[PDB]
Design a protein around this ligand. Structure first.
Ligand code: FCD
Ligand code: FCD
Ligand code: MN
Ligand code: MN
Length: 284
């Protein structure tokens, strides 16, 4: 057997960031200034996104190394937060639309936007950690689902196959191809196993802003005409459900859970379209 349905815990105090680490403009505001930015980035922007992406990838891998039964999701946030701040990066989620922590930690039936807190990870859990770094005036965004202890076969396979769906979609990225191929490839692969790809959350353009108005769907919709062009930067980040897509949001206003409490998994990279293919910006 795996654990029972989760419930919310208590948050630790807000974690401080030294003042010399520049804040994104939305910290201390209720909304963000984003959604109308260009989709192709300039070379200077891309070079700063490589640095933000590598720092985000390091924070994700250090917090993912700590996933084990007995560890709290708050402890993963401490690790991610400190890694970012020691690298002179601001954690982009902290204060984004009022989100209270430096990463999102989404176990088991939590689709996304789980809030690090007193929740204890236990054997059989799958733990998505999602971290974004703002440094050099740009963002870098990555997430991965990590197993805790011995995970049941149905949940292990969901994680491995989500990871594979994400990588197969990244390996389609090429100038001249339709953006819609990413969702065609993810949903065709998911559907081989009878999984359902979440539709109401998507990937996005990213650059000087977190969510720049470019939308990357992870389901099949070939009517989108957007073409991948050199210098475009965006995420591929499918959330894949064992059960139905219906979902609810907890009273905290953030945590998104499957209504049937069946488990879900997600992986994410920030990508650059190159002249030949793709470059993953969120690698170690
Ligand atoms: O794009 C992401 O990878 C992501 C993870 C969390 C969020 C997010 C979206 C909307 C409101 C707040 C938050 Cl933290 O966005
Ligand atoms: O373990 C690996 O080698 C592997 C393949 C894909 C990923 C991964 C890591 C971080 C975020 C996204 C993805 Cl797809 O990690
Ligand atoms: Mn993310
Ligand atoms: Mn993202």
């Amino acid at each position: 057997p795996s654990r029972t349905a989760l419930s919310p815990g208590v948050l630790s105090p807000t974690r401080p960031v030294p003042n010399w680490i520049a804040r994104p403009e939305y910290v201390g505001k209720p909304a963000a200034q984003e959604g109308s930015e260009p989709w192709v980035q300039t070379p200077e922007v891309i070079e700063k996104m490589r640095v933000a992406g590598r720092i985000a990838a390091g924070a994700l891998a250090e917090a993912g190394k700590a996933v084990a039964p007995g560890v709290t999701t708050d402890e993963l946030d401490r690790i991610a937060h400190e890694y970012l701040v020691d690298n002179g990066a601001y954690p982009s989620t902290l204060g984004y639309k009022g989100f209270p922590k430096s990463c999102c930690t989404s176990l088991n039936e939590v689709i996304c936007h789980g809030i690090p807190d007193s929740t204890v990870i236990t054997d059989g859990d799958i733990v998505n950690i999602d971290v974004t770094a703002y440094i050099g005036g740009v963002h870098g965004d990555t997430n991965a689902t990590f197993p805790a202890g011995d995970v049941a076969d149905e949940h292990r396979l969901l994680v491995d196959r989500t990871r594979e769906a994400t990588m197969r979609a990244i390996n389609t990225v090429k100038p001249g191809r339709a953006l819609s191929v990413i969702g065609r490839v993810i949903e065709s692969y998911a559907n081989r196993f009878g999984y359902n790809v979440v539709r109401d959350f998507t990937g996005h353009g990213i650059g000087t802003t977190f969510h720049n108005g470019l939308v990357v769907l992870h389901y099949d919709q070939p009517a989108v005409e957007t073409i991948m062009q050199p210098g475009m930067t965006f995420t591929i980040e499918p959330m894949i459900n064992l059960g139905a897509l219906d979902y609810e949001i907890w009273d905290d206003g953030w945590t998104v859970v499957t209504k049937d409490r069946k488990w879900t998994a997600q992986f994410e990279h920030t990508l650059l379209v190159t002249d030949t293919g793709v470059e993953i910006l969120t690698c170690l």
